[PDB]
Amino acid sequence: CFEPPPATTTQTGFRGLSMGEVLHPATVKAKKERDAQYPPALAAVKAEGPPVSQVYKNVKVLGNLTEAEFLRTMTAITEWVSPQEGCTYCHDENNLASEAKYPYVVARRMLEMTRAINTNWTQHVAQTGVTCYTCHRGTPLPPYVRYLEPTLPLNNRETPTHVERVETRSGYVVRLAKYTAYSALNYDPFTMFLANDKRQVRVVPQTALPLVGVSRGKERRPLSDAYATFALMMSISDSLGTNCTFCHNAQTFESWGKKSTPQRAIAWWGIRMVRDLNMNYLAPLNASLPASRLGRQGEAPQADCRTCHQGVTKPLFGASRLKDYPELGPIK
């Protein structure tokens, strides 16, 4: 079980602190090739004539687009999400305004969510932005999603073994380990941290001595909170294909300033972004999805850091189509 030299190493901290990335060149190249499948931008169309708001019948989101632009978007959407299936994945063959099929309405919300990320989560996605492809990767079900319990394989394009199957109780500890970089940490950071804003990630005191009043008996957070936080960080690390020192100087995890890299602030924003999407776009879709989409407690599949990043510190190595599809945001 070993990976041969050379390793690719970077520096993310002051010399002598052994901070930085440690990359196996072959893995990087293999991920590069997978992400290289990002379809290139459709040729630019000239905006002739009326907004489709006038022209078409049931266009809510992209109503201001001229027709040519609009069909350009519809084409891009098709090759990002449902290329195998074609336009009819979401449309009634004979009535295009028809909302008959759930992919239509789900796709309508996803146009909204997508323009949300690109307009409002600028502090995370910056000027790279996302598109339907960032998550979907050419299939309607995105390959990396989370339910309210751990599931395996992480890539839902792979076929589960018996033990992996969520119904197989004997395989629980492994479903959890594969989510936390193989640790034995008995916590699921997804449901604890990313599904909603209920829990506080920070667990480390900010004073040298114990403050009288929060430091004894039931006043205290249980130590199990520090395990969870560690589990989450194992997960975030494995999700971005990186290590702690990509973000922290481990001298003082709890400190920012010189003890934290810029990417930690960005990750801080991403935790907030992921919670927004889950709480406000993705989780509600359990209303609009077939039962076959939903998990064991009737939850829609939702997003963690892997859903976009899929093992790279910038999703798709920072490829952007933002200037090519302004429909999708930022929306002034």
Partner 1 sequence: MYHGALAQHLDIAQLVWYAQWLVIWTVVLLYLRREDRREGYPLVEPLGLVKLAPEDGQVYELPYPKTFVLPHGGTVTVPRRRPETRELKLAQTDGFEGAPLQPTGNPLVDAVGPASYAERAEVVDATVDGKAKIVPLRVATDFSIAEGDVDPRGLPVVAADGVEAGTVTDLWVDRSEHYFRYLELSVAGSARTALIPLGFCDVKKDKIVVTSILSEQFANVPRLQSRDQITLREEDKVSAYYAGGLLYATPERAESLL
Partner 2 sequence: ALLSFERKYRVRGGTLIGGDLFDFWVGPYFVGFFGVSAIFFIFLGVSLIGYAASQGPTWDPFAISINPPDLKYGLGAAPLLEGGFWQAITVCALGAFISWMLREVEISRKLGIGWHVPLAFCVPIFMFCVLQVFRPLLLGSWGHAFPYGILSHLDWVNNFGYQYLNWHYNPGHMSSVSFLFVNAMALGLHGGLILSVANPGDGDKVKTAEHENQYFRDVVGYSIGALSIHRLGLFLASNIFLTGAFGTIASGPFWTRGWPEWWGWWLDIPFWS
Partner 3 sequence: ADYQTIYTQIQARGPHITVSGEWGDNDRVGKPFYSYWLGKIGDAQIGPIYLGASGIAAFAFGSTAILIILFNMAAEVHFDPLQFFRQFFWLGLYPPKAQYGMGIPPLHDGGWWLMAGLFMTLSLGSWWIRVYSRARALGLGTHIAWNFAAAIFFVLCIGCIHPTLVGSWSEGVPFGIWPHIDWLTAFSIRYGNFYYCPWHGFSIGFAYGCGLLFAAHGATILAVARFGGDREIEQITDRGTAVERAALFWRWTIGFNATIESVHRWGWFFSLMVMVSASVGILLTGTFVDNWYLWCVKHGAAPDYPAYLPATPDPASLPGAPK
Region binding partner 2 by CB under 8 A among candidate stretches 38-46, 75-83, 111-119, 176-184: 176-184
- On whether 244 is known to bind a ligand per the annotation, the reply is yes
Tokens representing 84? 């195998």
Question: Minimum CB separation from partner 1 for residue 209, in Å?
Answer: 4
Question: Minimum CB separation from partner 3 for residue 203, in Å?
Answer: 6
- Which residues lie closer than 8 Å to 161 by C-beta, 6 or more apart? none
Residue 133 sits at the vertex; the CA angle it makes with 289 and 81, to the nearest 5 degrees, is: 45
Query: For 248, what's the count of Cα atoms within 13 Å in the CB-facing half-sphere?
Result: 14
User: What does the DSSP assignment read for 122-133?
Assistant: HHHHTTT---HH
Question: Does 186 engage in binding with partner 3 (CB under 8 A)?
Answer: yes
First to last CA, the chain: 52
Give the one entry of ligand HEM, partner 2, partner 3, none that residue 119 binds, where binding means its C-beta sits below a cut-off of 5 to 8 angstroms depending on kind.
none
Question: Minimum CB separation from partner 1 for residue 207, in Å?
Answer: 7
Give the one entry of partner 2, ligand HEM, partner 1, none that residue 61 binds, where binding means its C-beta sits below a cut-off of 5 to 8 angstroms depending on kind.
ligand HEM
- On whether 1 is known to bind a ligand per the annotation, the reply is no
Is the Cβ–Cβ distance between 266 and 281 less than 8 Å? no
Binding mask 156-175 for ligand HEM (x = CB under 6 A): --------------------
Size of the site for partner 3 (CB under 8 A): 62
Question: Does 166 engage in binding with partner 2 (CB under 8 A)?
Answer: no
| 3-state DSSP of 27-45 | HHHHHHHHHCCCCCCCCCC
Question: Minimum CB separation from partner 3 for residue 253, in Å?
Answer: 6
Binding mask 239-278 for partner 2 (x = CB under 8 A): ----xxx--xxxx---------------------------
Question: Does 265 engage in binding with partner 3 (CB under 8 A)?
Answer: yes
- On whether 110 is known to bind a ligand per the annotation, the reply is yes
Residue 116 to residue 331: CA distance in whole angstroms: 8
Show me where the chain is broken: residue before each gap, C-N > 2.5 A: none
Q: How far, CA to CA in Å, does 182 sit from each of 195, 199, 281?
A: 21, 23, 30
Question: Does 210 engage in binding with partner 1 (CB under 8 A)?
Answer: yes
Question: Does 215 engage in binding with partner 3 (CB under 8 A)?
Answer: yes
H or E element in which residue 226 lies: helix 224-240
Query: Would you say 220 or 258 has its CB closer to partner 2?
Result: 258
Residue numbers belonging to the annotated binding site for heme? 74, 87, 90-91, 110, 124, 132, 135-136, 233, 244, 247-248, 305, 308-309
